[PDB]
Design an enzyme around this catalytic site. Structure first.
Site, PDB file in Angstrom:
ATOM      1  N   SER A  48       2.719   1.051  -3.832  1.00 42.71           N
ATOM      2  CA  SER A  48       3.626   2.190  -3.995  1.00 42.71           C
ATOM      3  C   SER A  48       3.706   2.693  -5.437  1.00 42.71           C
ATOM      4  CB  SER A  48       5.034   1.810  -3.530  1.00 42.71           C
ATOM      5  OG  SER A  48       5.979   2.807  -3.873  1.00 42.71           O
ATOM      6  N   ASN A  49       3.540   4.002  -5.606  1.00 40.98           N
ATOM      7  CA  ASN A  49       3.730   4.649  -6.904  1.00 40.98           C
ATOM      8  C   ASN A  49       5.200   4.743  -7.288  1.00 40.98           C
ATOM      9  OD1 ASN A  49       0.859   5.358  -7.422  1.00 40.98           O
ATOM     10  ND2 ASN A  49       1.154   6.642  -5.608  1.00 40.98           N
TER      11      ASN A  49
END
Ligand SMILES: [Cl-]
Lengths: 328, 326
Positions: A78-79
């Site tokens: 996840s960014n």
């Protein structure tokens, strides 16, 4: 003028100046029409991204209420989690991350490199789970456990996508409108559509600032049928919070994410290779590679409302390149 | 302007606005010292870095000579090669890279991930060599070969460190001077191929003469590095019609056991900046330079006790190549 109630919400300054809006002459030459790019991948915090715009609003809200801990959820790569953890470190807030492996990979670089590596540098507390089946409920359970330790938690939903988080992209639309003013007559805008906050924010902003522009969301995780209600819900909630109406139809193309979220595909990979080799721009296999593949095919199949200039929103994601290499 | 001759050099715009100059309140509180940071890691091209400032001048020159190919050299994980390849792709130029493995590793991530991965994305032609023993000479041979193959090559030296390339860091110094009107006793920068150190040396002499510039070496002893930095300093100043008399300061205690090998102090500096400020340094350059800065505090090594500015020259994509180990 119409987006003036935006000034009401407290926000932290993480980005600073408006991000670059650039013409892409070589990509445009190859595709046979004018392509511009909104460089939201270029922000000063921990390798950048769209999630930072949302965090400006979410974290100011957290501070306003006296929270000292940010709790959020996402994939291992996840960014959002990475950007949330970076901001938490910067501000001396604690951070707890509920992570899932959405693709069942055992590949070591997916498991420990890229975004996941950065999490450890930010001293993120990691809570693993089998799957994020009910993220809102799972986050609250976690927040209860964390609160029992005496922390003051602030729950940030998946992808930072609440109406408040999405205000970041209402703001982005202002930048875009001003940057395009007397410079380029835009016809279409393309953005990846995932947890939906970016799409919804842009939808509200662009309806009011550039009403004749066609906004296209390329889904990265869901079909039109599943995704559209999520985008609409946020669009309406955003408009309500701003004392505005939003009558625009949401547009989504779902042909470009198969076989599913976080799984690279051939057209996505080809889009990544095309942007790198023609423009020296780095996309990613999860989000922007797939969104760009959608843009390219849209031109190929004449899917857009007309032949005019297209703005691609670069939402970031490049650190995942190092997690997805060499495979799985 | 005393630095007027800078606008006489053709330059491409790769960066645009000045990079942020930021206060680091949490690091500052922890060290009991005022620390600022020049965010040259935040440049818009292919994950950023200091090399881009140099390339603005080098590539402008390349186009003036009508080149269709850029040729340069570095380690497998070279930030300079990555930024040159991105720029070449952007401008529709071929790129040829002469690469060495400086550390004898067979680790997969070093060999194929990080900066090296990006080279493939940018369609870089890769030429492996055993060792860059004489880079300037080896680059020339390659260029003549490529020119004989029917191309128009332009040679960029290792790290982009020529007097022309170093003009990029005279430019950074102007930004520093502008931005520090609200603030300074010392500046700390990694000193490798020497263009950044030298460019800042010339700029800071004229713009902020009271400030001590410290280069933390990442590849050489003070004895080996000082003549390189002085020579560039003199060349830059000459081409700008300036005098450069300021002494060059170098600390060589922070790079063992050598170039491109992480050390504990360096990696701990990376962890410190990440955990306190959300800032990403790197194992090869900025981590070691920051390790030097921190030791400079604890050993009272600076000229006086005032605010310090760290030059973030970039390098973070190497984190992914050095993980988990080399
Ligand atoms: Cl074509």
């Amino acid at each position: 003028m119409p987006l003036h109630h935006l000034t009401r919400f407290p926000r932290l300054e993480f980005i600073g100046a408006p991000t670059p809006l650039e013409y892409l002459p070589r990509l445009s030459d190859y595709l046979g029409r004018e392509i511009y790019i909104k460089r939201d991948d270029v922000t000063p915090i921990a390798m950048g991204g769209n999630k930072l715009r949302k965090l400006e609003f979410l974290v100011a809200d957290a501070l306003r209420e006296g929270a000292d801990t940010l709790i959020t959820a996402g994939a291992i790569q996840s960014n959002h989690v990475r950007q949330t953890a970076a901001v938490a470190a910067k501000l001396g807030l604690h951070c707890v991350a509920l992570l899932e492996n959405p693709i069942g990979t055992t590949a070591e670089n997916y498991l420990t490199n890229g975004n996941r590596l950065l999490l450890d540098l930010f001293n993120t507390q990691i809570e693993m789970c089998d799957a994020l089946t009910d993220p809102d409920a799972q986050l609250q359970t976690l927040a209860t456990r964390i609160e029992a330790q005496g922390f003051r938690p602030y729950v940030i939903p998946v992808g930072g996508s609440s109406a408040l988080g999405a205000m970041g992209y209402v703001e982005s639309a202002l930048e875009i409108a001003q940057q395009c003013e007397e410079v380029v007559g835009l016809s279409s805008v393309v953005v990846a559509s995932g947890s939906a906050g970016t799409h919804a924010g842009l939808a509200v902003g662009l309806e009011h600032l550039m009403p004749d522009v066609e906004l296209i969301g390329v889904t990265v995780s869901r079909s039109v049928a599943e995704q559209k209600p999520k985008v609409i819900a946020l669009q309406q909630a955003i408009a309500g919070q701003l004392a505005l109406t939003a009558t625009a139809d949401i547009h989504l193309w779902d042909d470009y994410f198969a076989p599913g979220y976080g799984v690279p595909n051939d057209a996505g990979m080809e889009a990544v290779k095309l942007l790198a080799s023609l423009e020296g721009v780095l996309l990613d296999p999860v989000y922007t590679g797939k969104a760009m593949a959608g843009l390219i095919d849209g031109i190929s199949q004449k899917r857009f409302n007309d032949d005019g200039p297209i703005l691609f929103i670069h939402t970031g994601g490049a650190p995942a390149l190092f997690a997805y290499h060499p495979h799985v």
